[PDB]
Design a protein around this ligand. Structure first.
Ligand SMILES: Nc1nc2c(ncn2[C@@H]2O[C@H](COP(=O)(O)CP(=O)(O)OP(=O)(O)O)[C@@H](O)[C@H]2O)c(=O)[nH]1
Lengths: 620, 710, 400
RNA sequence: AGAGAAAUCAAGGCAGUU
RNA sequence: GACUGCCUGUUUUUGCU
């Protein structure tokens, strides 16, 4: 596209000086700028005085070296108005300014002495004086030779337009792109609908008042089992002589007898050999052990191939759309006993968090409230269960190489203040190659029980454990736990924050009303317990809030998330009516239908729904 | 739920914190997104007519309908053209400063918008590799494609990029001529960069040429095509939704439109989508000086927001604003391209609907075998399906809020409205309850006029104002902080100990400032985060780090090293290193080692860094932790090997080499953008002779340095 | 010189190994500075635990101070990490190994890197707190400058000030004019030991931190200062409150026939939206003596036209903005008083700032309204600077 | 088996021999 | 078939605004 009368070097140099594609007649402007650059480079063609070239060109040079040369000359030129070329022989600057009229002798600027040509060669009189005759002849030649190019390509209007004014932005959509754009719309690129602007008057429906709070449905079916990974409230520990983890696992492996009381079909009783081998290996000193014949059944090794082969063998011949059904199970009766056992009082503090520094009395107040909260919710079964969950999750996630093909043992061992070891159970990591966020790592968790149920633990195989005349119950389950869930249960201690937030709000509000912090307040809080309005003391309330939050966290399925999201609205409406305020709804507004869809099989959502529907539904 | 509703002391609204199952397993998506994609595509067509008739609706290009066609009872996709025109005119008549700032942005800010802003995004669909790639890589490949096919140089401005995209489609056939690695299974090692008793080896890479050809129709399809993905870790819904990403050939246009919407919405008082625009709702709520009048509060949400929204409505609104402002024709020819392209959108179908035969399942395309989506078979283009009505994904949230706000501006509606995409809240201030009901129904009908379609079961009106919600921020005579909303952000990040601690402290401080945390909650959060920090970085119990420090007499001096806590509640803003220096925990001997610039382990970064809580709105934090030896970076993932497209490694290493030669000769691109016109080679050359000539050396030495340059 | 030779060698290597990438435009650096295939920012919280425990879990540039094996532990790997030009992998203990058996640096370098952080720590441990007072406080969020600054700078002048601090030679006259001379020397003095090509990347961030005035939204119960804004997390809350402890010119109207008249002007954005902004104007004859640091002088006032100005200034001392203020009080130049800048304004603050920036970018109005002549005895030049060699000097100006 | 919920994981690719 | 060796555990079509 380069004109033959323009040098290739100056063309490639001017290619990117200014954006020529988004300018009105950008090609003509580029040609004009190439004209000016060829005029200035054509000037000072081997011309020199002293020991340096007579003229220095500033157009289209790096601005850093331009400033350097100007600093050598002890003169400063701005960017928005910089001369074309500077003459050091006469110590004056110049700018090539092509003008068609040639009668515009008026200087464009006073900083630099301007020079002009008439587009066919003739220069202004001072321009003729300040330049040598050979330079004038060369400019004549270039202007005439560009004039034939202008005439041949009939651009005589665009050239004068560009040398007259400045650049104008444009953005043009071609004819081919326009049709493709307009393929799928009735309107054109610039929508011009031929309709009179007005707002129609549309008739709607009346707004109804929600006189009574919605009643959540209660599904009917078999009781829901314990689907959590660990055991929860029905989890106990074995006291061991003080020492390291291996020094306790060896003690357990030596002084114990294992017999099967219960054998579930989900977890065969033959997987106990894997557990015994894992304990033996961990006792010897190597936590990681090789595979055994029972490990295939224990961790489902090569189960995908077997299931695929069986499915290929068993065929029907319809190829229908897959319809996945989710079984509906009612509220199990063990939720209440779990909530009442998780609130029981232990003897030791099970929340050991390192104290923060205290430099300002604001922190001393802050750490006092945290210490009191830990005192309230530490000596409690739920705190011990949170602890055991955290060790079970972290000692597996951390030693989850995430790329391994051998069985790994991760004991769940804690320590009491007296130093005695506490063997809650063992987690057996299996061959895992999880990459996606939905991949499941095979697990075989053995856990110490307190009481078997067979309607709460249907997939758990219960074994009888005898250690120094003491009879415990050992439960083995086969689970597959994803990396995301292991990650989120490694930070299970975060659940303490919400009841801590509630307790902090209560205490700080009491301090605000009394204008003084007490930190020993035990407020009486009224609640709808067993239907009637009874009261608690914020100590067992916060404790059972902690237990409920822990149960919600370990049972956090999409059903629970949707139920809570659609239940916050109903709770807000309950608050609104409790303040003698009336609630109105649009026409087809049934806010309980978005909640009833999330009550399917989760036990905690059923417990929450039963708690909701036991409350008064109308506030007179 | 009976334990979450106190009847004394604190209010139930303060217990909305307990209504979150966070700190538990976030729901994750399994299998194929194709069913969700087809559902989200068939929903706009089902909602067009009052009586569901998909087949007739599939022949509608512009979702303009008569006023009597709007289903006042249920979702209704489409808009009324005259209503859109009049509502846009009413919106323009008010908020004149916003329109003037829009004009300023158009004629002072738009001309110098650089296309390099496209590289600050995230994963985009690549029309060359047919996969999702990082935004810089896609931008580089598409710029190379345009330069090769148009045979010119792309200007630094985004306008030049858009003009190049507009001009490349004028061509008939296009080619790319990329690079591939012939055999990614033949890793070969060479001994380079070191031979002195410590040999260093770097992998070598072989290269070939793609030489792939695109026709006009194929390139247009790739521009139309928007790749679809599952929305993993979506907290708050029982049913998993689907996100999508457009190509790189429409993203510049989209950015122009979204920036225009940003400088419109940041100046109107009815918008909450500004980041600083969610704090005006506190001012509206505190504006409770009603003179004993019926003042309600309607907090709600919109159903099928991305489905019942026709791009032509917001296109018309944009062209109305631009025509009443006085902008030239090309301005309205630039703001209308994105909406006309997404009018012809080609949603990428998944890997196929799940068809089962007994127990085994097969993944079959939409066309093969009958399913529920038999009406959309006529819209299948390869593995992608077209859908004219609906947005299908939220690339336009700002202009969608703009449409919802121009809907607000009537004469009957005399209340206060706040709009943030889906969630919204209205503050009626009327004289009688009948007037309030009429205004609420007028609001509903007007949002249905342009297709906003509030969900009936999600909007609740309280006749005495004071109780409501907006973006998980509950209001009871004031807005109560919700600690639950940010709990997933208290887990330490995964970059390096210093940045992780800085982000943890900054998150806790931000939660305290916003009111979501207080003294005890913040202190407990810090104590939990400290233990999570120490465990995650091998500083608890017996580990490899503790062992290496034990049999080397390396005492722990940092929190990540297992030392005692140094950060108190009053000092989340302070940095660990300076705080330990002032308190006398770090001596000068250790400081001159960990802060030594000659560290081989430290990785340079930026104070501002990407922060996303969990698949939520991206956020920007401040990383003021000093670059000590503990500010490192993790090892690069190596899944890229055994893949044909591993040649991107060679290109990125060459680009790192070029970035290393820059930043050493140009001590200005660290402060501002690059603006020198020309190639990298020429600029580096000229700067080299400038730096050698500006130095203080002998003339012959300068000449020999020049001679050694080639 | 050694560094120049190394730069030449690196340039030659860049030309040789990467010829295609070096043929790209310079403006593409804004895009390929980030060209990486890494996805280390896509939910990194879920990968931290097993990624720092993985063999070779760190990235380290090759170096000689790190032995291959130290006391039986393999510290570093001999294979460069994929996609990384000059970095390899190492063991996670290398950061701990360097903390004791590592090289040292200058004490001044440590202070330079730890400047802003140590300033914040001293500010924290330099004030006396009050007594925590509990009450039902009402906190309202207000935009407040969070981090205290060494000197107040405009948000637009920060890049130019930083360019002056680090690369005063690679800058334009316009950028120098837009700088904030007065805070550049403080930054230079406190930053000199770290202004090296090795540490220029980390120096710019810490220099911006001392100079940036980011306006965060923070709760307050009393009007905070810049000092008591970075500490708002523990001084105010919903329950407790601890009680902690023309531009730059002088006018001196002196002799004046009439006082400064105020002609209120109404700019109509619309028949229904209008903005009223009055401007000060001198009526008749006045004699006003100004002063700005080391430059002083007085000018005559003939209606709204500058009759004559004379100044005493050091030689080659910039004088653009002082005479711009002079034109501001008196309304001697337009646009900026009577007609808009092409766009209708909002407030007087925005209007005066726009008047400053537009006329500092281009001072053509002052020259066209003020007077130009062809001689040499005139003191200043069209660029508004004192005695210098120049042409077409500004007329109607004498010495004092 | 199990995890699980509207469909997936229960290792997957590549080179050589076969 | 399977059967030897190599590789990958975010980069496999999957965290957009
Ligand atoms: N670009 C994005 N927009 C999002 C994202 N998440 C939500 N949104 C926005 O939120 C809206 C999507 O909500 P839906 O269309 O599902 C409407 P609702 O919330 O009422 O859900 P349903 O009742 O189930 O239809 C829409 O405005 C989106 O742009 C996201 O990850 N990216």
């Amino acid at each position: 596209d380069r004109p033959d009368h323009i040098d290739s070097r100056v063309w490639e140099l001017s290619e990117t000086q200014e954006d020529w594609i988004t300018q009105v007649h950008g090609h003509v402007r580029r040609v004009v700028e190439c004209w000016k650059y060829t005029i200035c480079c054509l000037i000072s063609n081997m011309h020199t005085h002293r020991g340096a070239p007579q003229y220095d060109v500033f157009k289209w040079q790096d601005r850093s070296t331009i400033e350097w040369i100007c600093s050598k000359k002890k003169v400063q030129y701005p960017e928005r108005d910089t001369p074309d070329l500077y003459d050091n022989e006469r110590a004056v600057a110049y700018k090539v300014l092509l003008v068609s009229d040639l009668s515009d002798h008026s200087p464009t600027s006073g900083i630099y002495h301007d020079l002009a040509f008439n587009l066919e060669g003739e220069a202004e009189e001072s321009c003729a004086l300040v330049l040598r005759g050979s330079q004038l002849q060369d400019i004549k030649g270039f202007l005439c030779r560009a004039l034939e190019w202008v005439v041949s390509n009939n651009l005589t209007q665009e050239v004068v337009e560009t040398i007259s004014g400045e650049a104008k932005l444009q953005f043009s959509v071609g004819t081919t792109f326009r049709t493709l754009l307009k393929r799928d719309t009735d309107w054109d690129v610039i929508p011009t609908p031929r309709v009179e602007p007005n707002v129609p008057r549309i008739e709607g429906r009346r707004w109804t008042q929600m006189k009574k709070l919605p009643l959540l449905k209660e599904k009917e079916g078999p009781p829901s089992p314990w689907r959590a990974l660990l055991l929860g409230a029905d989890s106990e520990y074995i006291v061991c002589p003080p020492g390291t983890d291996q020094e306790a696992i060896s003690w357990i492996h030596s002084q114990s007898e294992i017999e099967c009381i219960r054998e579930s079909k989900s977890t065969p009783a033959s997987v106990i050999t894997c557990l015994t081998s894992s304990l033996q290996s961990f006792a010897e000193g190597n936590p990681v052990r090789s595979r055994i014949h029972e490990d295939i059944i224990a961790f489902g090794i090569n189960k995908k191939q077997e299931k695929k082969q069986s499915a290929s063998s068993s065929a029907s011949g319809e190829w229908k759309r897959a319809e996945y059904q989710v079984e509906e199970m009612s509220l199990p009766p063990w939720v209440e006993e779990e909530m009442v056992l998780l609130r029981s009082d232990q003897e030791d503090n099970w929340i050991e968090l390192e104290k923060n520094a205290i430099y300002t009395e604001v922190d001393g107040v802050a750490e006092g409230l945290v210490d009191k909260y830990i005192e309230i919710v530490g000596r409690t079964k739920v705190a011990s269960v949170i602890e055991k969950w955290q060790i079970a999750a972290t000692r597996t996630f951390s030693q989850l190489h995430t790329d391994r093909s051998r069985i790994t043992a991760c004991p769940i061992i804690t320590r009491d203040p007296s130093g005695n070891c506490q063997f809650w159970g063992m987690v057996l990591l299996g061959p895992h190659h999880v990459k996606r966020d939905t991949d499941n790592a095979p697990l075989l968790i053995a856990e110490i029980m307190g009481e078997d149920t067979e309607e709460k633990y249907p997939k758990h195989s219960v074994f009888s454990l005898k250690v120094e005349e003491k009879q415990f119950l050992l439960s083995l389950k086969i689970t597959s736990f994803s990396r995301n869930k292991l990650y989120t249960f490694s930070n299970i201690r975060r659940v303490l924050i919400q009841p801590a937030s509630i307790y902090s709000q209560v205490v700080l509000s009491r301090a605000a009303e009394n204008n003084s912090l007490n930190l020993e307040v035990n407020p009486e809080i009224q609640l709808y317990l067993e239907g009637a309005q009874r009261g608690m003391t914020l100590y067992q309330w916060v404790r059972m809030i902690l237990c409920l939050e822990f149960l919600m966290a370990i049972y956090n399925n999409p059903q629970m998330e949707g139920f809570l999201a659609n239940m916050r609205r109903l709770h807000m409406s309950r608050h609104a009516m409790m303040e003698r305020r009336q609630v109105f709804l649009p026409f087809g507004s049934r806010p309980e239908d978005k909640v009833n869809e999330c009550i399917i099989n989760n036990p905690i959502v059923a417990y929450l729904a039963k708690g909701w529907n036991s409350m008064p539904n109308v506030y007179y | 739920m009976n334990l979450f509703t106190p009847l004394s002391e604190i209010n139930p609204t303060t217990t909305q914190e307990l209504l979150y199952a966070y700190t538990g397993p976030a729901p994750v998506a399994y299998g194929t997104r194709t069913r969700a994609v087809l559902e989200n595509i068939i929903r706009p067509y089902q909602y067009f007519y009052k009586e569901p008739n998909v087949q007739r609706a599939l022949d509608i290009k512009t979702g303009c309908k008569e006023p009597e066609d709007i289903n006042v009872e249920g979702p209704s996709s489409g808009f009324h053209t005259a209503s859109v025109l009049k509502l846009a005119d009413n919106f323009f008549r008010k908020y004149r400063p916003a329109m003037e700032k829009l004009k300023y942005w158009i004629l002072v800010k738009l001309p110098k918008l650089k296309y390099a802003e496209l590289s600050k995004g995230r994963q985009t669909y690549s029309f060359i590799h047919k996969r999702n790639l990082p935004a810089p890589i896609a931008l580089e490949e598409t710029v190379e494609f345009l330069e090769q096919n148009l045979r010119r140089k792309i200007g630094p401005t985004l306008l030049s990029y858009c003009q190049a995209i507009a001009d490349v489609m004028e061509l008939d056939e296009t080619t790319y001529e990329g690079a591939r690695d012939p055999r990614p299974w033949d890793i070969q090692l060479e001994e380079i960069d070191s031979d002195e008793e410590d040999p260093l080896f770097r992998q070598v890479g072989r290269e070939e040429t793609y030489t792939i050809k695109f026709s006009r129709e194929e390139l247009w399809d790739q521009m139309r095509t928007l790749n679809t993905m599952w929305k993993h870790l979506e907290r708050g819904r029982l049913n998993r939704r689907t996100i999508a990403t457009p190509s790189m050939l429409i993203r510049g246009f989209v950015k122009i439109v979204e920036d225009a919407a940003k400088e419109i919405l940041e100046n109107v008082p009815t918008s909450g989508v500004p980041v600083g625009g969610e704090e005006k709702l506190a001012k509206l709520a505190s504006k409770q000086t009603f003179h004993t009048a019926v003042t309600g509060e309607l907090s709600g949400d919109q159903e099928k927001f991305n489905e019942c929204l026709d791009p032509d409505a917001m296109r018309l609104m944009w062209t109305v604003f631009l025509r009443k402002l006085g902008c030239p024709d090309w301005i309205m020819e630039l703001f209308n391209i994105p909406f006309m392209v997404f009018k012809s959108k080609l949603a990428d179908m998944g890997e196929g609907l799940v068809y089962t035969k007994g127990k085994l399942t097969d993944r079959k395309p939409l066309g093969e075998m009958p399913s529920e989506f038999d009406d959309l078979v006529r819209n299948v283009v390869g593995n992608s399906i077209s859908c004219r009505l609906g947005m299908f994904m939220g690339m336009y949230n700002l202009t969608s809020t703009l449409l919802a706000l121009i809907s607000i501006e009537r004469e009957e509606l005399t209340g206060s409205h706040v709009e943030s995409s889906d969630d919204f809240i209205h503050f009626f201030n009327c004289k009688t309850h009948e007037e309030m009901f009429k205004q609420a129904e007028t609001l509903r009908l007007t949002l249905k006029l342009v297709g906003i379609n509030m969900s009936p079961s999600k909007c609740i009106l309280i006749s005495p104002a004071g109780i409501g919600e907006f973006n998980s921020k509950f209001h009871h005579r004031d807005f109560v902080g919700n600690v639950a909303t940010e709990l997933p952000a208290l887990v330490p990040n995964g970059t390096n100990p210093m940045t992780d601690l800085a982000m943890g402290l900054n998150v806790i401080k931000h939660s305290v400032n916003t009111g979501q945390m207080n003294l005890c909650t913040g202190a407990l959060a810090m104590r939990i985060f400290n233990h999570a920090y120490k465990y995650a970085y091998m500083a608890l119990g017996v580990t490899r780090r503790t062992r290496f420090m034990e049999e080397n007499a390396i005492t722990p001096l940092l929190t990540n090293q297992g030392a005692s806590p140094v950060h108190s509640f009053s000092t989340m803003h302070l940095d660990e290193v300076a705080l330990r220096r002032h308190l006398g925990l770090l001596d000068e001997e250790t400081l001159r080692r960990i802060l030594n610039p000659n560290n081989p382990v430290t990785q340079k970064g930026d104070p501002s860094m990407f922060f996303r809580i969990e698949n939520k709105m991206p956020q920007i934090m401040e990383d003021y932790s000093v670059p000590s030896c503990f500010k490192y970076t993790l090892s690069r993932n190596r899944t890229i090997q055994d893949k044909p497209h591993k040649a991107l490694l060679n290109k990125e290493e060459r680009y790192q080499r070029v970035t290393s030669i820059i930043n050493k000769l140009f001590p200005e691109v660290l402060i501002q953008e690059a603006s020198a016109p020309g190639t990298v080679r020429e600029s580096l050359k000229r700067r080299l002779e400038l730096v050698v000539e500006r130095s203080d050396l002998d003339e012959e030495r300068k000449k020999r340095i020049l001679s050694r340059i080639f | 010189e050694c560094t120049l030779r190394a730069l030449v060698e690196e340039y030659n290597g860049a030309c040789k190994e990467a010829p295609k990438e070096m043929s790209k435009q310079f403006t593409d650096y804004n895009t390929f500075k980030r060209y990486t295939t890494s996805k280390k920012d896509h939910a990194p919280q879920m990968r931290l635990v097993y990624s720092v425990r993985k063999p070779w879990p760190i990235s380290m540039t090759p170096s000689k101070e790190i032995p291959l094996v130290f006391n039986g532990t393999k510290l570093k790997d001999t294979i460069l990490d994929l996609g990384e030009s000059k970095r390899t992998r190492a063991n996670i203990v290398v950061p701990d190994y360097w903390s004791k058996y590592g090289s040292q640096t200058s004490l001044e370098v440590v202070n330079a890197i730890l400047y802003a952080e140590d300033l914040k720590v001293q500010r924290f441990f330099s004030t006396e707190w009050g007594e925590i007072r509990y009450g039902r406080m009402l906190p309202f969020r207000k935009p407040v400058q969070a981090c205290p600054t060494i000197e107040e700078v405009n948000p637009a002048s920060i890049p130019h000030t930083l360019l002056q601090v680090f690369c005063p030679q690679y800058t334009t006259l316009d950028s120098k004019r837009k700088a904030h001379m007065g805070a550049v020397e403080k930054l230079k003095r406190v930053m000199e030991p770290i202004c090296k090509v090795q540490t220029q990347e980390s120096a710019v961030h810490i220099a911006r931190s001392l100079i940036d005035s980011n306006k965060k939204w923070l709760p307050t119960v009393v009007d905070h200062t810049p000092r008591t804004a970075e500490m708002a997390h523990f001084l105010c809350s919903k329950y407790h409150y601890v009680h902690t402890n023309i531009r730059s010119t002088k006018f001196s109207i002196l002799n004046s026939d009439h006082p400064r008249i105020e002609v209120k002007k109404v700019f109509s954005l619309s028949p229904d939206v209008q903005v009223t902004i009055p401007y000060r104007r001198f009526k008749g004859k006045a004699k006003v003596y100004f002063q700005n640091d080391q430059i002083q002088g007085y000018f005559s006032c003939t209606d709204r036209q500058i009759d004559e100005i004379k100044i005493s200034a050091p030689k080659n001392a910039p004088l653009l903005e002082p005479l711009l203020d002079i034109c501001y009080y008196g309304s001697f130049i337009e646009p900026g008083f009577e007609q808009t800048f092409g766009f209708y304004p909002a407030g007087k603050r925005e209007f005066v700032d726009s008047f400053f920036m537009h006329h500092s970018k281009d001072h053509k109005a002052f020259l066209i309204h003020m007077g130009l002549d062809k001689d040499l005895s005139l003191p200043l030049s069209p660029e508004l600077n004192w005695k210098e060699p120049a042409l077409s000097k500004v007329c109607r100006v004498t010495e004092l």
